[PDB]
Amino acid sequence: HPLKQYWWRPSI
Incomplete structure (x- = not known):
């Protein structure tokens, strides 16, 4: 279950 x-x- 990453980010x-x-x-x-x-997050860009």
């Missing part, structure tokens, strides 16, 4: 759910928008 795939962390790509809220700032």
